[PDB]
């Protein structure tokens, strides 16, 4: 082979993104766009290993509380403005500022940056945040507790810089295609809502000399069977994650070498609205957990290597090893189901007067299949005491419904943002901006709070096991399985491994070969 003269690629991104402003979003389709247009302090290769981004060098004090980043002195934004430490100060302050209403506001609290939580609570002004431009090219981060995993946290979309001069001038409109300015490998060529996003090289990117792909198109195909049919017709080069379960064994044999799949740091759940009747009743949350047979979903509905789970954190994540699956998961279903029926009758439900709710999910045939199966099991397993409807919404609408609390039970799927257990544990803090379940237990908050001071991995791992135990005894959610990330990838696409624990995909890591 050799490199193709044309370096164009078409990738399914799966949904129309909520926004291209990383302070306004919390989803994978959105981050996939942001990572092409913007670059944070540190970035990664195709396997998720760290490499210099906007910062060419960095260091930490021995107590893991002070992090210093040396930015590139000649780096520019795509409009020619210099990239400076002031852009990072600006962006990080904007993320925690309540006026931004950022879904990931809490991420800086997770990093333990001084005053981040007070600012999110409105007790201090965003300028009190513990980050500084010591000079134009030196950005320093001050944490209140040891955060030895800090560098990995800095790769997340929510900590991408923004072009201060542009955003201050244009406000939220900076994001329009005509106005967008970034320091990633690409820039926006075109955007047709619900159809396509087109990328072109950002020639001012500091590492443009190593970018190979010249142009790329993201599609917004919601259903896996549509994705696969487009791929087969040669009209896209990489599917989104997820393949039709009925086709999976065949695809693997027929398109041998094109199907990538591995276990993923992700958990699929039904999130229960803990402040909406009747899911504010732990008894009912418990009955739903008891009566859902996870193995039906992972073995009969899906069958792609998803593994059943009854806890939120994947136990194979770094420092997750002490977390235990709850004892009910070891009971026969017949025992679990009788228990669930008693709970529901104790709560006043009967065949004539069942527990009625809708499963909210984002349009996607695989989510539909899982919801049909869940509805079916809950009804049958409780002998008619639960009656479930399905409510499918387009991605953007689904996201807004979850955040607004306009749901009873919602399909959910959380991917690790960094390879350390707190990317999951921190989600269920009572004051987390990510916690759309409205779960709140001060004991849970305290078990996580006590982990942040811990000096070592075992002490952190014990605290995460306790947090999970409290969340599990509260039945705060309904965990179903841990993800795998099956995707089809054409044989002429190289640089994709699928082995990145954060499952980032950077166009600047790909290339097209010929023959």
């Amino acid at each position: 082979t050799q490199l193709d003269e044309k370096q164009h690629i078409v990738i399914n991104n799966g949904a129309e993104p909520q926004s291209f402003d990383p302070h306004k979003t919390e989803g994978v389709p959105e981050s996939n766009v942001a990572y092409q247009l913007l670059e944070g302090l540190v970035t990664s290769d195709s396997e998720g290993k760290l490499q210099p981004g906007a910062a060419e060098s960095w260091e930490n004090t021995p107590d893991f509380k002070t992090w210093t980043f040396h930015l590139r002195k000649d780096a520019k934004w795509s409009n020619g403005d210099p990239v400076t430490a002031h852009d990072f100060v600006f962006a990080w302050r904007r993320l925690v500022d309540p006026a931004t209403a950022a879904p990931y506001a809490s991420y800086l609290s997770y990093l333990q940056v001084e005053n981040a939580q007070d600012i999110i609570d409105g007790k201090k002004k965003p300028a009190e945040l513990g980050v500084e431009a010591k000079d134009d090219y030196t950005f320093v981060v001050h944490a209140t507790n040891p955060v030895p995993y800090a560098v990995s946290l800095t790769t997340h979309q929510s900590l991408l810089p923004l072009p201060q001069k542009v955003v201050e001038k244009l406000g939220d409109a900076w994001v329009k295609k005509e106005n967008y300015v970034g320091n990633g490998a690409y820039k926006l060529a075109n955007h047709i809502i619900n159809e396509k996003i087109e990328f072109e090289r950002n020639p001012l990117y500091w590492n443009d000399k190593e970018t190979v792909i010249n142009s790329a198109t993201f599609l917004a195909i919601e259903n896996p069977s549509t994705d696969v049919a487009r791929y087969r017709a040669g009209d896209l080069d990489m599917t989104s994650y997820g393949l039709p379960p009925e086709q999976f064994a065949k695809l693997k044999k027929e398109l041998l070498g094109e199907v990538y799949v591995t276990r993923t740091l992700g958990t699929y759940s039904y999130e229960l609205n803990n402040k909406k009747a009747p899911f504010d009743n732990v008894n009912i949350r418990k009955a739903l957990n008891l009566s859902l047979d996870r193995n039906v979903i992972t073995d009969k509905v899906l069958g792609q290597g998803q593994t059943p789970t009854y806890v939120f954190t994947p136990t194979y994540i770094e420092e997750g090893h002490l977390i235990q699956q709850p004892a009910y998961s070891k009971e026969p279903m017949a025992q679990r189901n009788e228990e669930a029926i008693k709970l529901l009758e104790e709560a006043g439900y009967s065949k004539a007067n069942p527990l009625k709710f809708s499963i909210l999910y984002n349009t996607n045939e695989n989510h539909k299949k899982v919801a049909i199966a869940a509805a079916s099991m809950w009804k049958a397993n409780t002998k008619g005491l639960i009656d479930v409807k399905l409510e499918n919404q387009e991605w953007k609408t689904y996201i807004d419904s979850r955040r607004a609390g306009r749901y009873d039970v919602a399909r959910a799927g959380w991917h690790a943002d960094y390879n350390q257990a707190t990317t999951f544990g921190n989600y269920f803090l009572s004051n987390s901006s990510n916690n759309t379940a409205k779960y709140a237990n001060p004991e849970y908050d305290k078990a996580m709070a006590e982990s942040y001071a811990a000096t070592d991995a075992e002490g952190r791992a014990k605290a995460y096991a306790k947090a999970e135990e409290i969340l599990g005894k509260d039945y705060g959610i309904v965990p179903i399985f841990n993800y795998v990330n099956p995707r089809l990838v054409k044989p002429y696409v190289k640089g994709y491994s699928g082995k990145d624990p954060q499952d980032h995909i950077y166009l600047r890591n790909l290339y097209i070969i010929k023959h």
């Binding site: 389709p29 896996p224 699929y268 996607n364 799927g413 943002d417």
Partner: peptide
């Protein structure tokens, strides 16, 4: 991050 797919 919220996963859109399955």
């Amino acid at each position: 991050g919220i996963i859109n797919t399955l």
